[PDB]
Amino acid sequence: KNPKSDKFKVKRFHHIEFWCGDATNVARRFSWGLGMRFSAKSDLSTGNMVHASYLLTSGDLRFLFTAPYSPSLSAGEIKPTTTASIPSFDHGSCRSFFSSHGLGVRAVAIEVEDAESAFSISVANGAIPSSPPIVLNEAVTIAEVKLYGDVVLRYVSYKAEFLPGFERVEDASSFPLDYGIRRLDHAVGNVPELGPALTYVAGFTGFHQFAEFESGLNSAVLASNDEMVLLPINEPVHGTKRKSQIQTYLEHNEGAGLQHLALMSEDIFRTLREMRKRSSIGGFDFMPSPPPTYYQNLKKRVGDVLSDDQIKECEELGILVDRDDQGTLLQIFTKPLGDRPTIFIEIIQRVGCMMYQSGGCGGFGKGNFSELFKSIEEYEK
Amino acid sequence: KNPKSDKFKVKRFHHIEFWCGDATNVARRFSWGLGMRFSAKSDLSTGNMVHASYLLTSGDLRFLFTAPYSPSLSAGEIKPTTTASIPSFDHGSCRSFFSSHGLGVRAVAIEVEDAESAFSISVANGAIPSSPPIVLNEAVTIAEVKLYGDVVLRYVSYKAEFLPGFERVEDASSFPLDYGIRRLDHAVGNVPELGPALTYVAGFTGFHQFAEFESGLNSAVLASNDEMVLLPINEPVHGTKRKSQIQTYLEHNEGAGLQHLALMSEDIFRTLREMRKRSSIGGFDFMPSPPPTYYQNLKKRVGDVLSDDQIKECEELGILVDRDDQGTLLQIFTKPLGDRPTIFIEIIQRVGCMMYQSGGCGGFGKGNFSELFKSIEEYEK
Numbered sequence: 001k002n003p004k005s006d007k008f009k010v011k012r013f014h015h016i017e018f019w020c021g022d023a024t025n026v027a028r029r030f031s032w033g034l035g036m037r038f039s040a041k042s043d044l045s046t047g048n049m050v051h052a053s054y055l056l057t058s059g060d061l062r063f064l065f066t067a068p069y070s071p072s073l074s075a076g077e078i079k080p081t082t083t084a085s086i087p088s089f090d091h092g093s094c095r096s097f098f099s100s101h102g103l104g105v106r107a108v109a110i111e112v113e114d115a116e117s118a119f120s121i122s123v124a125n126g127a128i129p130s131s132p133p134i135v136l137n138e139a140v141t142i143a144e145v146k147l148y149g150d151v152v153l154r155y156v157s158y159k160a161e162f163l164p165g166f167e168r169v170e171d172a173s174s175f176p177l178d179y180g181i182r183r184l185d186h187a188v189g190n191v192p193e194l195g196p197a198l199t200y201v202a203g204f205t206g207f208h209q210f211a212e213f214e215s216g217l218n219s220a221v222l223a224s225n226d227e228m229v230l231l232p233i234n235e236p237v238h239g240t241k242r243k244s245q246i247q248t249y250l251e252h253n254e255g256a257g258l259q260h261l262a263l264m265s266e267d268i269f270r271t272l273r274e275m276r277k278r279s280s281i282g283g284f285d286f287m288p289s290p291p292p293t294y295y296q297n298l299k300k301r302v303g304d305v306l307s308d309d310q311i312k313e314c315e316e317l318g319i320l321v322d323r324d325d326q327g328t329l330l331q332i333f334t335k336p337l338g339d340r341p342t343i344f345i346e347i348i349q350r351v352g353c354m355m356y357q358s359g360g361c362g363g364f365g366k367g368n369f370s371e372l373f374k375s376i377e378e379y380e381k
Numbered sequence: 382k383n384p385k386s387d388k389f390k391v392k393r394f395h396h397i398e399f400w401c402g403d404a405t406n407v408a409r410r411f412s413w414g415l416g417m418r419f420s421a422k423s424d425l426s427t428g429n430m431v432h433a434s435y436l437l438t439s440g441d442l443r444f445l446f447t448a449p450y451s452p453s454l455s456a457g458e459i460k461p462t463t464t465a466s467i468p469s470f471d472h473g474s475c476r477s478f479f480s481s482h483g484l485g486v487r488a489v490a491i492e493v494e495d496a497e498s499a500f501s502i503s504v505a506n507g508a509i510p511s512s513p514p515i516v517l518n519e520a521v522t523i524a525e526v527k528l529y530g531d532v533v534l535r536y537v538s539y540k541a542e543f544l545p546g547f548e549r550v551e552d553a554s555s556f557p558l559d560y561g562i563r564r565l566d567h568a569v570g571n572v573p574e575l576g577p578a579l580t581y582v583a584g585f586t587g588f589h590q591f592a593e594f595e596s597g598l599n600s601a602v603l604a605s606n607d608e609m610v611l612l613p614i615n616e617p618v619h620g621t622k623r624k625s626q627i628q629t630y631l632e633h634n635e636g637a638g639l640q641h642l643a644l645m646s647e648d649i650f651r652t653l654r655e656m657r658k659r660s661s662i663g664g665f666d667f668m669p670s671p672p673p674t675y676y677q678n679l680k681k682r683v684g685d686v687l688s689d690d691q692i693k694e695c696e697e698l699g700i701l702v703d704r705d706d707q708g709t710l711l712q713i714f715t716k717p718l719g720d721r722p723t724i725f726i727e728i729i730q731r732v733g734c735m736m737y738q739s740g741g742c743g744g745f746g747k748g749n750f751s752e753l754f755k756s757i758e759e760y761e762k
């Protein structure tokens with residue numbers, strides 16, 4: 001059931017911002033590992049004496065990488081006179097974030113009709129404000145509120161290229177990499193207690209629980225009116241035999257934060273061949289593949305949807321497959337993006353629920369827990 | 382003239398350590414951009430609850446990338462009980478370094494016969510101690526003293542694979558990249574005043590001035606007995622028309638520190654083709670090429686040494702060429718390795734001074750200042 005109860009008009013995911021110590025090296029690593037192009041920059045070369053920010057793009061997916069310069073470069077400035085292109089940036093806030101969490105997402109940004117309004121209603125409805133609405137070059141409006149831990153939900157709205165004060169990147173320096181990733185599908189939070197986190201976020205957004213159908217976690221998914229903005233949240237399950245990975249996240253991250261980004265590919269086979277090609281030459285590693293007993297049970301579950309040639313292709317690439325009642329999903333998970341066992345990336349492709357494709361089509365793969373356990377026990381014997 | 386006056390026996394450059402906020406992303410970027418292989422690791426997977434350290438290797442070149450984990454992982458440990466593989470590491474020291482300087486070299490490490498002795502004599506001879514000598518697993522000894530700014534000279538000696546507590550890297554995860562780089566040739570410091578820096582370092586090492594033959598800098602080179610360890614130092618020249626890059630380093634780095642690493646290639650043409658191939662797909666950019674007026678004057682200067690086919694090859698790759706009285710050098714410079722206009726890398730190849738090749742053969746390219754000015758003025762007209 002979809003109550004369509006957003007308290008303000010929410011369009012789509014707009015970008016994801018990583019807070020870094022060196023934005024250049026993370027950016028060039030993500031670019032190659034994921035096949036994202038260098039699109040825009042705000043840095044010393046553009047008159048930004050405060051922070052270096054580099055934007056990567058694939059399809060509609062926007063990854064922003066930001067690090068602080070020495071505060072001494074802008075010691076003479078004040079907020080009215082700043083050269084920061086993102087006015088919410090704070091040197092001390094950024095340094096404390098990276099040193100507390102390591103590499104991680106600072107902002108999940110969603111486009112909205114009216115950012116100042118979305119901020120006002122949000123804060124009226126329980127949101128802890130993080131950065132008040134600011135109007136950039138009479139063109140774009142930006143506002144921030146707390147989401148969980150040190151992660152903010154960022155509202156951006158346009159009266160009528162990324163943000164003012166960014167420059168488009170030198171096409172000689174900008175190589176058109178592309179491995180098929182097109183857009184952000186969901187962004188997932190880890191918290192110590194799911195109940196109060198859900199109440200708070202649903203409280204100020206109007207987002208509703210997105211319905212779906214003894215290991216790991218309890219989770220629930222918050223969704224906008226058209227279920228195109230999707231913000232799941234996990235909490236750990238204590239007491240089990242095997243330690244909760246959610247609980248391992250919270251230990252190494254020093255508390256709650258963004259756990260994974262799910263990136264939709266238009267061709268999850270091309271994407272996964274291209275990323276796997278580069279795993280050991282600067283790219284990303286993937287979680288261990290499931291045992292062929294898995295793929296030996298996929299015919300009896302999705303053989304309707306995928307040909308035996310296409311299941312074998314899942315087998316070589318290590319792709320996992322789950323099924324809702326309206327659609328099917330193909331998914332795989334990278335190893336953690338940095339030093340700590342915290343944030344990782346998910347690649348997904350959704351098949352079904354054509355009307356455009358409705359959001360969440362197929363769910364989020366919580367069935368793959370049961371099938372992997374079954375598979376593992378099958379393969380053992 | 383070579384007084385051969387080292388106060389302790391110095392062998393060769395052993396490794397260079399970068400202090401990072403995320404060692405994984407810097408490491409994977411350097412690996413691809415430079416063609417260095419993943420050799421050893423010390424991290425959570427090896428029982429190191431303190432820091433993540435990843436070693437890249439090309440030839441005899443060792444690049445170590447280290448970042449701190451959350452201090453809460455080792456809150457219960459004490460120095461006697463630490464799980465750090467590098468006992469000199471300090472969480473607070475590392476965080477303060479990265480936040481003061483951004484990405485940069487923390488340690489220039491040289492092998493020596495006796496590390497405890499090298500430390501004792503050094504400190505007896507004016508060296509500010511930084512980490513006392515420590516004996517790792519009865520096998521290796523490690524000691525540190527201050528070099529300049531927050532950079533330390535690290536002594537390592539072996540009684541008889543990198544360091545104890547590192548593991549050799551999974552050969553599946555370890556791809557044999559190689560673009561021809563073989564060893565570290567020199568490591569160069571920027572300081573505000575060259576005189577006191579030279580007096581101090583030469584003071585406790587016994588290193589001697591290495592002789593050579595209105596823009597930029599004043600520099601001088603300290604060298605070991607066999608001139609295989611080479612530690613030049615720059616200071617800025619104020620008052621010029623155009624700002625000193627040395628002075629720009631000191632502003633953005635928040636003081637003195639390591640300015641560039643010169644890496645010897647056995648084939649500077651293969652190396653530069655392979656790095657240039659990857660400049661815009663995650664690798665390194667290079668300083669702007671000199672104008673062809675440069676290469677139109679190289680026949681009259683090194684035509685003895687390089688064929689007209691080989692000068693044209695310099696022309697496509699942007700290689701610079703200088704000449705001492707004993708040998709010739711080919712050199713080029715990358716753009717800064719990270720966000721700040723601070724550290725960069727130099728690729729070099731030396732031709733001449735065969736006896737093995739003596740160190741510094743050809744010098745360090747200070748003649749290319751004059752020739753570039755001449756060239757620029759030539760091309761203008």
Ligand SMILES: Cc1c(C(=O)C2=C(O)CCCC2=O)ccc2c1n(Cc1ccccc1)c(=O)n2C
Pocket residue numbers: 186188216217219232245246260262333346364365366368369372
């Ligand atoms: C991350 C993930 C998902 C996933 O994305 C997902 C959502 O999007 C929202 C709803 C709930 C959910 O589970 C699905 C299946 C998975 C999986 N992981 C990695 C893993 C498991 C446990 C704790 C930390 C990390 C795994 O092994 N399987 C088999």
Ligand SMILES: Cc1c(C(=O)C2=C(O)CCCC2=O)ccc2c1n(Cc1ccccc1)c(=O)n2C
Pocket residue numbers: 567569597598600613626627641643714727745746747749750753
């Ligand atoms: C770094 C460098 C060197 C070089 O390596 C070198 C040493 O190894 C030790 C002795 C002195 C020395 O100069 C040679 C020529 C260069 C050069 N640079 C970049 C640059 C210039 C000015 C201030 C910052 C950076 C440039 O443009 N030319 C033409």
Ligand SMILES: [Co+2]
Pocket residue numbers: 186188260262346364
């Ligand atoms: Co997911």
Ligand SMILES: [Co+2]
Pocket residue numbers: 567569641643727745
């Ligand atoms: Co040099």
